């Protein structure tokens, strides 16, 4: 334990994370850099997430805590475009640096910020533009010019058309038609590692690890006699010749009661069998193994199944083919049947493990991204990337205001910041205007990853800002030349920018009133 | 605490040494004139020698992350080439060395480096297209057009000087299969002694088993059975039973109705009307008699891999429940008798029913060529199995490379600007793969390489370099030929993986647990 | 040993004393604190600061233990109890030095407190009549703790949500344990809703998710600890068995047992049912074919709060159902915030409580949140029995102080400097926040000298204008009634402490 | 060559790396810190730099021989000559372990190479000579080239008036010691003065006039510090004191005959080489004659030279030997201390240059300039050829380098391509300090020399390709010639090291 008051714990504190926050800031925009995080087991992760590098990192002093506890609510709320925010989640500590040395008290910092904050937000909602106004087809070239901008951030963006159909027609099979509604919990990406990134298509399902057992038979059988869904069927309860569980005795007193225990089972073996052939379901998924002499006789029946499967993928094949689990094999019956379009397994690499994959042609529940890539450690990178696309759609449905990206926000709302500063005059002039300022340091950051000059083009936005009101100016992040994003297509969710910036303003309230650190061992 | 973190001054550096130190073990393993490499274990006391990084970089420990993508790609190398893979480590080491060279000269940022291999990949993928030549519309050159393919794609172990022995292995074994790419069903087998050209290619199955009693050792018109239930260990149970009882008369009599469970066991395996029987586990000594007892073969000890491969390559069917005899299907084989290869004397199988399946005799002189013989046949009828799919090729041996580098020229004057700086390095890096090639055989890597560039500009796409004689050969009348499939994978997976190690600007190190 | 000892009893609450300078007050900073369950507090009231402060020194602990005395009495602003108590051991130092006894200064400072007692209800008055009361009155004196720790902007908007949560409170009853509220992680900091019943998170989940009904409209409450699952009987499940088709029999009778039980949770039809224990996934598709809302993993202080809201009850045998174990409400709305599904009871046939529905990732927001509800039913408590309040932000000590200088300076001699030394250690309160208000403390105690003199009495210190003015007449108030058990309780644990010579560890 | 050589490439790269901050003219000044005495020194001058740095590799510790070579030589641009060398070793690293060729015939390459680079500066050389009225005027903007390359170029229009007038007076004189620097701490680099005479940081005697004119200056090595020393293992052997006090006495008055002697001479002003006893001192005041002491040797081998007098130790006749005369001896404080200023000496012999700065690192690291520049102005009027530097002296080297490529052909124009490689690398390397664009600046100028421009070169100021004869950029032929030829020379010894042997330490 150590003795630390006055400026010792008020400001090495806050420049602490201020120097950890600025080893990402490299990573900020589609021109970032990518770098590696060894685990404490020995693993090795590389991205350039904000949020998955610092959740994984083990830092030393406290604030690291006040980082991931923001990015725990921003996954749950916003979690748009990660790369990008997690940057200005850490620029409003380092202004008030400056604000401290100036003599102004740091409540008076932090509740300086609050008060601009609700007037930059208002000033954001003047150039919205509303998406929800057209029909669907042009919502769906909105998602098209947004998918280019927002879907593409991390590494892959080499070619972004094979990705592109991939998240808009995921949100198009789970929609309101009057584009008010969200599900993200049905829609779960599995990627393996194989082939070439661009064979990504799209099926919908979900992809067992666990392969028809008894390779005494067809590795998919692609179509029915029976049609209507192929008849998927799935046992809750252990599949096993009939015993009790509980504690008990057998006593044999003749020969007839030994035989009887013989033809017990085997008086089962074709009870179990017949009642899955009688409702002539295909696909029956036993979750805890099978029995041994009972391995064949799906194969004679002509009935595929599997063992192992975890709980949580047999919650949506339920939801998907629009069945129920069979609880028991006295509850057995055809109403519980499901509804699998088509059925197969992959062939992967050459031997591995074949990989099943159900998939429904028409509308399901679960719609899933079939994904595989050539790269191992770009699996769980893609993945994440696309994961947050669900709530990019949902930040679009939610929220029907959507303002042009590239940095041209806080571009817009610092020319009002600065002129309701001298309304309030005062201390809070500039308090009010370091508030803008610090905001006046994104897009001369988004210009240092891309080397051009920051200032000059940050000179250049506010004096085009002036003559006209149109926000469609901003900072170029790719080099594409002239600073309109209105012909590139750059727009981003106006909830997305709103919140990620108010609860951070809000975090940070209470961080700069920290004086003292105190801590104890667990 | 004791986390070590590097900025981007000293993880630039370390991460591309990292690559090129671990990066020249395979750069001599290169085309049939590669070398090998040794690994000393700490555990057991044992060796790796082979060619393919798969088995050699993956044991070797390094705390450089650079190659760690490297050994998680090269599953997707074994799962399609598998021979020779070790290329897309080494291009890739030649991609971080040319842009920290490209760095240290030109000094733009690293994103725009990455830009540049992006627009180069797409003048590679137009040269492999364009020289794609299908001959599988004539099915005369097609058959003979494999032994072509499989002289590329069979040169990898240092017992490649017996290729033209092992030629016709492949040749035939691929048209057995007709659309097999399994390797369960492919049967292969080691033995150890005899020459190195004695291995053959024999139709039927090869048992490593033998006969435990009585059973005769020659075996005519006998119908083959596989069954997973248990005979060795019999009463086994696993009930909620207790045995309890009065007096050791009613004792006897549970190991009596154990006969009589046996006796009508045997029953219905004699209602099937086979003269061979299978099993997965052992055979107890009561069964084993009665199957000598009504004329029954005997096989024992088949283990989960084992089993599959009995029905597999003669075309039966595993059986279980011989409640139902009527209901499943009997192996046959036209002779079944027990053959002698080397020291262990083995089962031989003649006339399987199904040809769908083949099995592969490997006989060797040393313990080192079986693994090695293995990692050689590891992709072998597979890679022929892909060219079955997949009949567009190309000739390859290294000129391949050379005609994308002119693709790669060519697009380089379209683009200019200052993005063609890591397109050109994308060029140069490239022709350096078959200078490596040419440094393993010890010829002259400088002026057969000026001549092989200046060769492609001059329109000629069948030149290539010449293995053996050292010389400019053309690929046509040496049979080099390798399919589109196969290297658009190694071209392309090895700029993927090269644009995510030019993006790491930091190198964290956690303490150890 | 000797006064020595006492000095090292003072400085191990002079650390404490320390660090809960920043805590009194609302321009008063916060201080960070780790404990041993991962738990980082950031607050601005020492309420719970003192609970999880790790306690070194073993004569620390005495100021630990009048804490939870003035925790369920007042709850809010108790901070200043140790400080203040911190100070009269802190200005006994020079006392020390002297041979002044510890019960001399013991004498001292009771006289102190026996008359502040009597001056507590001389200086407030019987507000009443038609001036401010319900509604009114209780938003005033709401809005001074909570406004004066956290958000200090938003707090016209979130204090008053939370004043109106309060008004649900009557006389006649004035239930203590009505505070019971839940946590809700996730959501915006300056969004909340009510609800004015008790609400339960999922915590688990099955595959027929997506398949419950959320909204309800006239359901039927059922209490019920019976666990569905397949597992083995209570004691002892051996069974004696003979013939071969009874083994399966038994397999049918587990099934049975279990499946009539199944029935007769749907025979009965309240559409609210509610497990104590965990509910397994073998109940789940039979009973998600009758679509009743079902909740397991329930706490069992979550099913007690439902026993006291609709009069309900748990009971292990279906057959023994009562008509009344079967309750009613209003409406059902079930609400799913980030994923996450909330049951809501509205309209019990008793409810008083109101359980608030926070928002935010923030797990420390709510200590304070559930601390300013512990202090809203201390002010509904106290404006009943006896009515009147005081002026708030701290100023009504200070008035308090001079009269104490007044009266002892011609009592018993050496009584004025201990009595004197009381009235100085008062004067800590608004040092503190002048210190922590980048104020003059010099400037502002020599104007309340003549602001509690010839400034009448009223007259409190305003912190937004940086200026001197009535709090009284700005309708801020503070409790009166919460002064008179927080002066009484630090006077008797500063002379305990006082009192000890030695200290004794064994081992 | 694997393990042969290893750490001669990469190891000598990277001590060029260290340096190449420092140079060309925008560069950089890099700070020596030792590790004892807890001293520091700035120098941008790699003859500093490489000797107080500890260096593993022996190959290293070679560049430092090679370095006091064009330190004495030249001492000037001294970086890019073991930079030069660097990038030699950097395309050794292919040509002889890739292209697999034998490193005595790359050494052969470069041998060819040299020699066709020692046809190329003759020929591009420019004749600057006989008439010194425009030779003078253009050493104004020759010296600028090579005056300043450190970050105190703001003098150098204020010292090209006064390095000019500094050989003026020398009228010929290519010694180094007839010029005099003077360092002096605070002030301005614009503060220098240049008067003709010398000023000295002594002083006077205490009632010695502060304005004498027409003084007559004569200096000597005796010793006047007390009696006679006389002969070695000496004694006085007397009867009582009364004989001592005399000879101690006595030799008082004989020492004072030998200072008659000196007012013999009529001189006005006395320069002792040793200190001076009060006594000896003060008969210098009656006789009105300023006295000078405490020079250990060049003290009174630098007043010479200004003087142009003679060392007397006999004092015996005052008709031969010399007399020196100097019209304004007066003490002149400048500064803190105070000085002894001459002027109006008898000739031109000698000429002293005074420079004022704020930091002491600036009076020593500066010296350095000035010093080296009068050695170009020496070597101008000796070598008559000049040529163009700023970049460009390398692209006309790389076209005469190409030109013979063609010629050899074989697999040595390799190693011949790869010298015109290094040559391509130092412009690079040049241009690297500035932060300007490599492509686009050598392109430019490799170009232009192709098409038969040879005045354009590097401009690091604008940033683009300007006239070097309108900037003022002209090196001497002496310089160029012992740079490339001693560089070209340097790598040739390193390449034939294909062994390594380390010895036990001591």
């Given at each position: 334990k150590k003795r630390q008051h006055g400026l010792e714990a008020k400001k090495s504190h806050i420049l602490a994370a201020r120097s950890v926050a600025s080893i990402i800031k490299t990573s900020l925009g589609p021109r970032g850099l990518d770098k590696i995080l060894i685990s404490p087991d020995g693993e090795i992760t590389i991205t350039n997430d904000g949020a998955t590098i610092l959740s994984q990192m083990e830092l030393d002093n406290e604030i690291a805590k006040l980082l991931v506890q923001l990015s725990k609510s921003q996954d749950d709320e916003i979690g748009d475009g990660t790369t990008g925010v997690v940057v200005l989640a850490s620029a409003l500590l380092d202004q008030a640096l400056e604000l401290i040395q100036?003599?102004?008290?740091?409540?008076?910092?932090?509740?300086?910020?609050?008060?601009?904050?609700?007037?930059?937000?208002?000033?954001?909602?003047?150039?919205?533009?509303?998406?929800?106004?057209?029909?669907?087809?042009?919502?769906?070239?909105?998602?098209?010019?947004?998918?280019?901008?927002?879907?593409?951030?991390?590494?892959?963006?080499?070619?972004?058309?094979?990705?592109?159909?991939?998240?808009?027609?995921?949100?198009?099979?789970?929609?309101?038609?009057?584009?008010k509604d969200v599900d993200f919990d049905l829609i779960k990406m599995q990627g393996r590692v194989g082939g070439s990134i661009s064979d990504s298509k799209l099926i919908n399902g979900v992809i067992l690890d666990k392969d028809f057992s008894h390779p005494q038979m067809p590795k998919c059988v692609?179509?029915?006699?029976?049609?209507?869904?192929?008849?998927?069927?799935?046992?809750t309860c252990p599949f096993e010749p009939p015993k009790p569980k509980t504690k008990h005795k057998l006593d044999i007193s003749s020969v007839e009661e030994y035989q009887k225990l013989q033809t017990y089972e085997q008086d089962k073996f074709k009870e179990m069998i017949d009642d899955v052939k009688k409702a002539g379901a295909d696909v029956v998924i036993c979750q805890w193994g099978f029995d041994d002499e009972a391995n064949h006789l799906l194969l004679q029946n002509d009935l595929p199944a599997v063992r192992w499967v975890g709980g949580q993928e047999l919650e949506h094949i339920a939801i998907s083919t629009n069945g129920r689990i069979v609880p028991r094999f006295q509850d057995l019956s055809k109403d519980k049947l499901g509804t699998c379009s088509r059925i197969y397994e992959q062939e992967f690499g050459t031997t591995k493990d074949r990989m099943l994959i159900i998939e429904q042609s028409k509308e399901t529940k679960t719609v899933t991204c079939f994904v595989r890539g050539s790269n191992k450690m770009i699996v769980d990178e893609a993945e994440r990337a696309l994961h947050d696309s669900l709530c990019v759609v949902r930040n679009l449905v939610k929220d029907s205001r959507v303002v042009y990206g590239g940095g041209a926000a806080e571009v817009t709302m610092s020319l009002a910041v600065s002129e309701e500063a001298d309304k309030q005059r005062g201390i809070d002039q500039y308090a009010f205007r370091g508030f803008a300022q610090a905001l006046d340091t994104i897009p001369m950051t988004l210009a240092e990853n891309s080397g051009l000059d920051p200032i000059g083009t940050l000179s250049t936005l506010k004096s085009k800002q002036l003559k006209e009101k149109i926000s469609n100016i901003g900072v170029d992040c790719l080099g594409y030349g002239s600073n309109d994003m209105k012909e590139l297509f750059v727009v981003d969710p106006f909830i997305g920018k709103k919140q990620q910036i108010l609860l951070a303003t809000q975090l940070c309230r209470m961080i700069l009133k920290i004086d003292n650190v105190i801590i104890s061992g667990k | 605490d004791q986390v070590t973190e590097e900025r981007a001054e000293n993880a630039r550096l370390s991460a591309f040494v990292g690559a090129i130190a671990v990066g020249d073990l395979v750069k001599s393993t290169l085309g049939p004139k590669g070398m090998d490499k040794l690994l000393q274990s700490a555990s057991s006391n044992t060796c790796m020698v082979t060619n393919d990084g798969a088995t050699i970089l993956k044991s070797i420990p390094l705390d450089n992350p650079a190659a760690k993508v490297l050994v998680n790609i090269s599953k997707v190398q074994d799962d399609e080439v598998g021979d020779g893979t070790t290329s897309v480590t080494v291009l890739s080491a030649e991609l971080l060395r040319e842009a920290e060279k490209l760095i240290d000269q030109s000094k733009?940022?690293?994103?725009?480096?990455?830009?540049?291999?992006?627009?180069?990949?797409?003048?590679?993928?137009?040269?492999?297209?364009?020289?794609?030549?299908?001959?599988?519309?004539?099915?005369?050159?097609?058959?003979?057009?494999?032994?072509?393919?499989?002289?590329?794609?069979?040169?990898?172990?240092?017992?490649?000087?017996?290729?033209?022995?092992?030629?016709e292995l492949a040749t035939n074994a691929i048209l057995r299969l007709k659309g097999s790419t399994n390797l369960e069903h492919i049967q292969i087998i080691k033995i150890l002694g005899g020459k190195l050209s004695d291995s053959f290619l024999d139709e039927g199955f090869i048992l490593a088993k033998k006969f435990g009693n009585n059973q005769p050792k020659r075996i005519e018109n006998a119908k083959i059975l596989i069954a997973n239930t248990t005979l060795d260990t019999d009463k086994v149970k696993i009930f909620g039973t207790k045995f309890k009882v009065?007096?050791?008369?009613?004792?006897?009599?549970?190991?009596?109705?154990?006969?009589?469970?046996?006796?009508?066991?045997?029953?219905?395996?004699?209602?099937?009307?086979?003269?061979?029987?299978?099993?997965?586990?052992?055979?107890?000594?009561?069964?084993?008699?009665?199957?000598?007892?009504?004329?029954?073969?005997?096989?024992?000890?088949?283990?989960?891999?084992?089993?599959?491969?009995?029905?597999?390559?003669?075309?039966?069917?595993?059986?279980?429940?011989?409640?139902?005899?009527?209901?499943?299907?009997?192996?046959?084989?036209?002779?079944?008798?027990?053959?002698?290869?080397?020291?262990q004397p083995f089962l031989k199988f003649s006339g399987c029913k199904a040809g769908e399946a083949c099995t592969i005799v490997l006989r060797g002189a040393t313990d080192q060529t079986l693994d090695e013989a293995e990692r050689s046949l590891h992709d072998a009828l597979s890679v022929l199995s892909q060219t079955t799919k997949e009949t567009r090729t190309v000739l390859g041996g290294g000129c391949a490379e050379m005609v994308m580098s002119k693709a790669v020229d060519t697009e380089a004057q379209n683009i200019d600007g200052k993005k063609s700086l890591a397109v050109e390095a994308f060029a140069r890096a490239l022709r350096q793969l078959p200078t490596i090639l040419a440094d393993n055989a010890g010829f002259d890597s400088s002026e057969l390489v000026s001549k092989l560039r200046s060769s492609i500009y001059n329109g000629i796409s069948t030149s290539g370099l010449d293995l053996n004689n050292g010389t400019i050969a053309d690929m046509r009348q040496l049979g080099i030929v390798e399919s589109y499939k196969l290297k658009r994978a190694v071209v392309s997976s090895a700029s993927e993986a090269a644009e995510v190690l030019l993006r790491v600007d930091n190198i964290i190190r956690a303490r150890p647990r | 040993q000797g006064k020595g000892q006492i000095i090292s009893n003072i400085n191990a609450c002079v650390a404490v004393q320390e660090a809960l300078k920043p805590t009194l007050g609302p321009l008063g900073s916060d201080i960070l604190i780790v404990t041993s369950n991962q738990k980082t507090t950031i607050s601005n009231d020492g309420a719970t600061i003192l609970k999880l402060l790790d306690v070194v020194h073993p004569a620390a602990k005495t100021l630990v233990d009048i804490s939870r005395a003035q925790d369920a009495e007042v709850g809010d602003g108790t901070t200043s109890?140790?400080?203040?108590?911190?100070?009269?051991?802190?200005?006994?130092?020079?006392?020390?030095?002297?041979?002044?006894?510890?019960?001399?200064?013991?004498?001292?400072?009771?006289?102190?407190?026996?008359?502040?007692?009597?001056?507590?209800?001389?200086?407030?008055?019987?507000?009443?009549?038609?001036?401010?009361?319900?509604?009114?009155?209780?938003?005033?004196?709401?809005?001074?703790?909570?406004?004066?720790?956290?958000?200090?902007?938003?707090?016209?908007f979130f204090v008053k949500m939370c004043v109106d949560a309060v008004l649900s409170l009557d006389r006649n009853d004035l239930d203590d344990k009505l505070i019971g509220i839940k946590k809700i992680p996730g959501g915006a900091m300056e969004e909340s809703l009510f609800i004015n019943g008790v609400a339960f998170k999922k915590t688990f989940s099955y595959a027929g998710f997506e398949q419950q009904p959320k909204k309800f409209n006239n359901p039927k409450i059922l209490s019920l600890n019976v666990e569905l699952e397949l597992k083995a009987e209570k004691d002892n499940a051996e069974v004696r068995v003979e013939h071969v088709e009874d083994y399966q029999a038994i397999v049918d009778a587990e099934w049975q047992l279990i499946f009539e039980k199944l029935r007769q949770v749907e025979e009965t039809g309240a559409n609210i049912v509610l497990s104590k224990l965990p509910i397994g996934d073998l109940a789940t598709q039979f009973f998600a074919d009758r679509n009743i809302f079902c909740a397991g993993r329930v706490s069992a202080d979550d099913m007690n709060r439902v026993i006291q809201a609709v009069g309900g009850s748990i009971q292990s045998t279906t057959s023994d159902i009562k008509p009344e174990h079967l309750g009613?409400?209003?409406?059902?709305?079930?609400?799913?915030?980030?994923?996450?599904?909330?049951?809501?009871?509205?309209?019990?046939?008793?409810?008083?409580?109101?359980?608030?529905?926070?928002?935010?990732?923030?797990?420390?927001?709510?200590?304070?949140?559930?601390?300013?509800?512990?202090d809203a039913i201390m002010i509904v408590k106290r404006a009943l029995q006896n009515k009147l309040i005081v002026a708030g932000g701290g100023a009504t000590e200070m008035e308090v102080s001079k009269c104490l200088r007044d009266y002892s300076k011609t009592i018993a001699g050496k009584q004025q400097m201990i009595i004197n030394a009381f009235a100085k250690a008062l004067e800590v309160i608004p040092r503190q926040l002048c210190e922590n208000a980048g104020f003059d403390a010099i400037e502002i105690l020599n104007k309340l000298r003549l602001a509690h003199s010839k400034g009448e009495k009223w007259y409190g210190v305003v912190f937004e204008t940086e200026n001197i003015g009535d709090n009284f007449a700005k309708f801020v108030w503070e409790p009166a009634l919460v002064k008179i058990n927080a002066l009484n309780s630090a006077t008797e644990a500063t002379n305990l402490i006082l009192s000890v010579d030695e200290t004794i560890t064994n081992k």
């Open positions: 100036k003599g102004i008290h740091p409540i008076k910092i932090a509740n300086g910020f609050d008060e601009a904050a609700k007037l930059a937000i208002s000033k954001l909602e003047e150039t919205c533009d509303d998406i929800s106004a057209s029909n669907d087809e042009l919502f769906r070239d909105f998602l098209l010019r947004a998918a280019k901008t927002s879907l593409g951030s991390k590494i892959v963006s080499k070619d972004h058309d094979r990705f592109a159909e991939m998240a808009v027609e995921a949100v198009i099979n789970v929609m309101d038609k009057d584009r692609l179509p029915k006699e029976g049609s209507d869904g192929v008849k998927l069927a799935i046992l | 733009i940022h690293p994103q725009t480096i990455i830009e540049g291999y992006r627009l180069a990949s797409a003048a590679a993928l137009d040269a492999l297209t364009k020289a794609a030549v299908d001959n599988s519309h004539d099915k005369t050159m097609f058959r003979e057009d494999l032994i072509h393919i499989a002289k590329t794609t069979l040169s990898s172990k240092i017992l490649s000087q017996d290729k033209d022995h092992f030629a009065d007096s050791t008369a009613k004792l006897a009599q549970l190991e009596k109705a154990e006969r009589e469970k046996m006796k009508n066991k045997i029953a219905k395996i004699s209602k099937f009307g086979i003269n061979t029987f299978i099993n997965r586990q052992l055979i107890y000594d009561y069964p084993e008699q009665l199957f000598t007892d009504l004329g029954i073969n005997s096989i024992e000890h088949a283990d989960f891999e084992g089993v599959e491969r009995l029905a597999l390559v003669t075309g039966g069917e595993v059986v279980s429940t011989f409640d139902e005899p009527s209901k499943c299907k009997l192996g046959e084989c036209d002779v079944i008798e027990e053959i002698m290869l080397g020291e | 109890v140790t400080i203040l108590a911190g100070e009269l051991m802190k200005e006994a130092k020079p006392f020390l030095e002297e041979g002044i006894s510890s019960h001399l200064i013991m004498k001292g400072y009771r006289k102190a407190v026996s008359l502040a007692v009597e001056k507590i209800n001389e200086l407030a008055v019987d507000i009443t009549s038609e001036k401010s009361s319900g509604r009114e009155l209780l938003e005033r004196c709401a809005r001074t703790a909570m406004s004066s720790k956290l958000i200090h902007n938003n707090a016209d009613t409400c209003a409406l059902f709305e079930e609400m799913q915030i980030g994923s996450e599904r909330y049951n809501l009871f509205q309209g019990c046939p008793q409810a008083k409580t109101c359980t608030l529905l926070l928002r935010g990732g923030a797990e420390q927001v709510i200590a304070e949140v559930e601390r300013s509800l512990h």
